[PDB]
Amino acid sequence: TARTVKDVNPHEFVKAYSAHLKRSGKMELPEWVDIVKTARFKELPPSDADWYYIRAASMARKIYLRQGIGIGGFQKIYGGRQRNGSRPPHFCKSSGAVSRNILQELQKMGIIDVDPKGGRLITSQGRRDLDQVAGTV
Amino acid sequence: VKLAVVVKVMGRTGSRGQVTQVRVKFLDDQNRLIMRNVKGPVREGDILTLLESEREARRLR
Amino acid sequence: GKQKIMFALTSIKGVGRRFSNIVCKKADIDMNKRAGELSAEEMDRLMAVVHNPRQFKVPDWFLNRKKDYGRFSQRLKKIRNHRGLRRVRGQHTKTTGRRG
Amino acid sequence: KVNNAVLFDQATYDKLLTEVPKYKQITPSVLSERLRINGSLARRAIKDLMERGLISIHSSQQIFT
Amino acid sequence: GTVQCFGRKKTAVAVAYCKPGRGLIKVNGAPIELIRPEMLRLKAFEPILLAGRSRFKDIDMRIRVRGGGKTSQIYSIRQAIAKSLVAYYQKYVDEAAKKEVKEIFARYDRTLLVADPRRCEPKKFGGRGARARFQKSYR
Amino acid sequence: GDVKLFNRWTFEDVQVSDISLNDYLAVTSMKHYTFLPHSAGRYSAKRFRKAQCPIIERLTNSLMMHGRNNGKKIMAVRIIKHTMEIIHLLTDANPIQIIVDAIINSGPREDATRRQAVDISPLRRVNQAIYLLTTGARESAFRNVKTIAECLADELINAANSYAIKKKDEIERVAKAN
Amino acid sequence: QISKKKKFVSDGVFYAELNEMLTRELAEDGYSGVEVRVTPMRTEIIIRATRTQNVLGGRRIRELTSVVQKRFNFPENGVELYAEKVVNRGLCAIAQAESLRYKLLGGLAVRRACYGVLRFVMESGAKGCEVIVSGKLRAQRAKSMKFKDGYMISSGQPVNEYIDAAVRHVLLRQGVLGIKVKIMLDWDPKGKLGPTTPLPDLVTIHPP
Amino acid sequence: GRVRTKTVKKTSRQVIEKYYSRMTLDFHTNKKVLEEVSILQSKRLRNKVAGFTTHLMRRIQRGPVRGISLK
Amino acid sequence: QHRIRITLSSKSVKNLEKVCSDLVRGAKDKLLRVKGPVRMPTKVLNITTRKSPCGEGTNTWDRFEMRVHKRVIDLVSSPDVVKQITSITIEPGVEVEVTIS
Amino acid sequence: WNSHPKNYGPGSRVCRVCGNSHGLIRKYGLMCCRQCFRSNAKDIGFIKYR
RNA sequence: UUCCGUUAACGAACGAGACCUCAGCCUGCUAACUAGCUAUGCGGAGCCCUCCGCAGCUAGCUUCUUAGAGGGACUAUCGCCGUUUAGGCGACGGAAGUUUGAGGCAAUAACAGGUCUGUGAUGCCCUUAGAUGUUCUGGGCCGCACGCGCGCUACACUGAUGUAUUCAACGAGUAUAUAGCCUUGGCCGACAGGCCCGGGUAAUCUUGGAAUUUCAUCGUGAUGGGGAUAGAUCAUUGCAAUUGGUCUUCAACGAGGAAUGCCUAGUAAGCGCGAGUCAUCACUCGCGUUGACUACGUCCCUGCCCUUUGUACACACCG
Ligand SMILES: [K+]
Ligand SMILES: [K+]
Ligand SMILES: [K+]
Ligand SMILES: [K+]
Ligand SMILES: [K+]
Ligand SMILES: [K+]
Ligand SMILES: [K+]
Ligand SMILES: [Mg+2]
Ligand SMILES: [Mg+2]
Ligand SMILES: [Mg+2]
Ligand SMILES: [Mg+2]
Ligand SMILES: [Mg+2]
Ligand SMILES: [Mg+2]
Ligand SMILES: [Mg+2]
Ligand SMILES: [Mg+2]
Ligand SMILES: [Mg+2]
Ligand SMILES: [Mg+2]
Ligand SMILES: [Mg+2]
Ligand SMILES: [Mg+2]
Ligand SMILES: [Mg+2]
Ligand SMILES: [Mg+2]
Ligand SMILES: [Mg+2]
Ligand SMILES: [Zn+2]
């Protein structure tokens, strides 16, 4: 009778919701989409020309799954392996200004809001949109 | 190609103890009892293949 | 010749993976085709993008030859410098250096 | 040094069409090693197959017939 | 019928809470059919694919898994669902059905009803690994 | 029956054309045949315990080499699934049968040690066959266009002319000369 | 304020400092440990000595009470410090340790001094005793010489509560002599003699 | 290995020597009698003693042995 | 009125357990509800150090390890009766802290 | 006199017991060298368990 | 040298065992607002049902986490073997049939083994005032044509690279001076980094805690494996330059001769995390994750132990 974010797998969900943001045509884009690397440990910036919308869909699902995460939390979850050459590999974070910016746009779309608990929370309209797009799968 | 069933194990023998000397009887002729050696792990009641059925052996090799 | 433009321009000095990426996508050039397909109508565009970084909105830090001794852009032996004369990095060369 | 072709002519274009029903196995690696073509062009040929549908899909291998 | 069953493997525990209904199966609030990786998915459909859906067609299952690794969590749920389905009949239906499903599960694999006790032992000093030591250079 | 390999392969068709290697291979369709070759069971505890282990488990566990591949049984069983699909789709038969035929045609019979020649244990026979097949696939896969599944499939069918059969040939030649 | 971990470490190192300070001042009296307790508004620190009539001198005890109050910045009228007599001089390891040190320093032969200490510990009622003296006694070469008797366990958990050990470095005329004294304690269920628990190898039987 | 320390051998011999009247064949009865007829600190030492006593009752129920006396 | 929390910190299990049972039973004497005792997770301090004063010889490290045990008691009562109950004697090794809860 | 900034480093921290400038343990504010600290481990309360 | 027995020995001391710590099982008990489970009530979306969050000073409970008292295993039963002992092998059961695993402690006798540069432990010799200490300034230990020793990173397609699922434990964390520690959150900054709101002297706050896994560009080329080495550049730490960001540079390296080291089960091997080191900079000690091949035998080599035997050795065959 209804398929919900739980009922549909994350991969096809995030790709469909990235397409949803693609033809939505409301949220803005920065001037540095291709040039900037999403993380300093990364060498090649994301080869996908529309990487920004895929990333924004990843945020749209993440805030639905868990709430109260700040800029540092998203900087942490998008980290990974940093190989320092002949030195042993280690952990590294991701970019912060781009995450701050995309979160600010998502606030401008009303999908999220600031909280007294620290971080962000999903607004009812945004999770409603996620619910019906899950139902359209 | 005379398949033989291991009938008794005579303890590990050899320089390193890698070979294990056993007594076998043929499935085609049960009454014939020979002595041979086998590498690897062998337990009683097993069935073992061979190529030459005329080679003999010695006790506690 | 046959390598993708993503890394075909790695061969020419002064340009690696990063600048190749910054040029193949700032001229609105197709990315999923090899260099052998590329013809003259886009070679001029590629050279225009490469030779004019700052005028093409290259982020200012991206340029490699930054603020020469005085313009952002893409002698040590004579001045008697420890860097020109010399390992300059200050390495424990007790063990290494066995190449000659 | 195996110098496989980077661009395919109409020759390979129709040989692959002819042999794809009769090939009990078609894979990018076998196609590349047999028809003297690059693995990327083997991928493109298998997408042309899916366009024509003369027959799994995985990030590393493709098994179809 | 509401029972608690804990499935433990290494350092992963899957807590299953039973409730009567229409046989809905959910893990961590997500469907059992969306077990990732999908290729180890058949490892967690063993009780359903062996006992059969007719056994659990009238009681749902909701499991939450914590700790361990991915494979450890998969084994934890693998044994937790089994324990919960034994408790299905042991406390709420009868003895014979529970006994026979337990025997069938045991004859399929011992781990389904017995928790494997293998744990990581502490690492000893004077060496790299827990049991391995350094390279000995006499001169 | 109700138990099939990946819900796809039926075990109740595969036999062994020998009465010396029956119990060491878990291919009988009454027990010891599983859904997939990944299980967290202990088989090194007691002697001859690995005989009860499924053959597919042995094949998928012997591929985690070299040192850059161990601890990655997931890739091992995925590759075995890929090569299994290749074998079944090409040969139009039960891939279990091809696996059993390759193992039963890739086991050496006699060696020579101490130098005197003498026979080989059946458990050591199947173990050596599996090790030889995995090492041959690794040799054919290193620095080549081929992926793991393709060379594994080719070596499996060719052993049912091949690396493993030639290794067994030279081992038996060394054995039979002493 | 101060976290629990830092406070616990501070009291541990403070007790060690107190032990070291008191053991290097009561050489004429045989310092034999200290008991420290924290009652509401009071910090009691009772010193032990084999000879107590000389610790009192009780003004000197009040000076040593002010010692911890003002050296460690402790609050006034919250710290108390008195002296106490040993229950058993012989059964105490350090007591006989510095007793042997004093005996050898006075001019007695070391052998006779350890025989006397060895007789005294059995006078106390020890299960067994061991005295080890290492260093140069008369010759340039150093030697290790031991006198042991009675029950003398050497391994296991019971070694750290069924024995009492003491080690000292007596500065002699020609160098430093190392002395070690080990005393086994019997099972006293009350606990006044030694441990309150029996040995694993000691089993008692009720007659039928 | 599974061989018994002289302490447990000795104590089993003594408890059977002085308390053969009531002590029975089951291991758990043997240990629940041992815990109050004698003072054993280690619980697993007590278990070893009880099992050993059970084994010697198995030995003696067929005939006399060389260990115990009285009557 | 004016709930009171008492914290019992020590290193020895036996002393803490006996004094906790004693204090809880004393609180029960005055017919007072007590939520507990709550056994706070024990905290372990681990330190490793080289035995050899000079690095000569094979490297052997000893591993000192200390345990810190804690209990917490909440009593819904006036603080004065809490002070009366805790005013009784104590055993060595146990530290008592009182706070308004 | 002591003009060099001794706000940190081994020139400012010494073992509380002995006074060495090397082997200083600092975990939990012990502030002592390994030899002296191992000497008084029983005194501090540091006892071996395994 | 654990025991049974044999017995010119009898009766005893150490060592071993016994002991202690941790893990492994408990739907049994103790009891949890600085920890949780369920139902309900409210609000969120598609009455019910799927479903996320918030309360209910008791909705109920401790099955799930914590920590305590306890229990559980003792080889007892089965068969065989052995002597009818000591015990061993294979069985059912059980969480466990190896004293269950892993450790701590660990006898006598020595080494001219190491440490005087850890010690207001110390004897002798030496400096004791153009001081061999003391205080600061600067350098040096970091040298390099060269030999060796322990580890890090690779030789790639089982992979690199780029998207998108996401599962741990150990421990540690403030002087409040605006604020020295852990840092949450907001803002700015491509990244490195900076400002503001603040919490935690702690199960409360940090703590909401990677290889692997769908998808694709590579395509067998010393190539996008590899990044040695260089230059330009920004900022952090530090009183004073160490490290970390960006781009450019892209060396040897295509499984390694004689020799050689570790390891038998959640072990090896692979991947990270914490702590020590610390004004700044990670090898050692622990933690967890994925997870196997073979062996379960032997004294062939390298040793160790015991008995007999030979000796011209006793600094003891390097005699
Ligand atoms: K990430
Ligand atoms: K050099
Ligand atoms: K030191
Ligand atoms: K509701
Ligand atoms: K010294
Ligand atoms: K000196
Ligand atoms: K490079
Ligand atoms: Mg370049
Ligand atoms: Mg003993
Ligand atoms: Mg012991
Ligand atoms: Mg519970
Ligand atoms: Mg027990
Ligand atoms: Mg010497
Ligand atoms: Mg000094
Ligand atoms: Mg000096
Ligand atoms: Mg240097
Ligand atoms: Mg080392
Ligand atoms: Mg990847
Ligand atoms: Mg996790
Ligand atoms: Mg490369
Ligand atoms: Mg490179
Ligand atoms: Mg170091
Ligand atoms: Zn010191």
TrEMBL record, chain C:
Transmembrane segments: none annotated. It is found in: Cytoplasm. The keyword Ribonucleoprotein applies. GO terms for molecular function: RNA binding; structural constituent of ribosome. Mg(2+) 2 binds at residue 91. One of its GO terms (cellular component) is cytosol. Mg(2+) 1 binds at residue 15. Keywords: Cytoplasm, Metal-binding, Ribonucleoprotein, Ribosomal protein. It comes from the Eukaryota. Coiled coil: none annotated. Its main location: cytoplasm. The keyword Transport does not apply. One of its GO terms (biological process) is translation. Belongs to the universal ribosomal protein uS13 family. This is 40S ribosomal protein S18. It comes from Triticum aestivum. The chain holds residues 22 to 143 of 152 of the full protein.
TrEMBL record, chain D:
Keywords: Ribonucleoprotein, Ribosomal protein. GO terms for cellular component: ribonucleoprotein complex; ribosome. This is 40S ribosomal protein S25. The keyword Ribosomal protein applies. Belongs to the eukaryotic ribosomal protein eS25 family.
From TrEMBL, chain E:
It comes from the Eukaryota. Signal peptide: none annotated. GO terms for molecular function: RNA binding; structural constituent of ribosome. One of its GO terms (cellular component) is cytosolic small ribosomal subunit. InterPro entries: Ribosomal_Su5_D2-typ_SF, Ribosomal_uS9, Ribosomal_uS9_CS, Ribsml_uS5_D2-typ_fold_subgr. GO terms for biological process: maturation of SSU-rRNA from tricistronic rRNA transcript (SSU-rRNA, 5.8S rRNA, LSU-rRNA); translation. Keywords: Ribonucleoprotein, Ribosomal protein. Coiled coil: none annotated. Belongs to the universal ribosomal protein uS9 family. This is 40S ribosomal protein S16. It comes from Triticum aestivum (Wheat).
UniProtKB/TrEMBL annotation, chain F:
Transmembrane segments: none annotated. Mg(2+) 2 binds at residues 141, 144, 146. The keyword Metal-binding applies. GO terms for molecular function: RNA binding; structural constituent of ribosome. Mg(2+) 3 binds at residue 146. It holds the Pfam family Ribosomal_S7. Belongs to the universal ribosomal protein uS7 family. This is Small ribosomal subunit protein uS7c. The gene is LOC123068729.
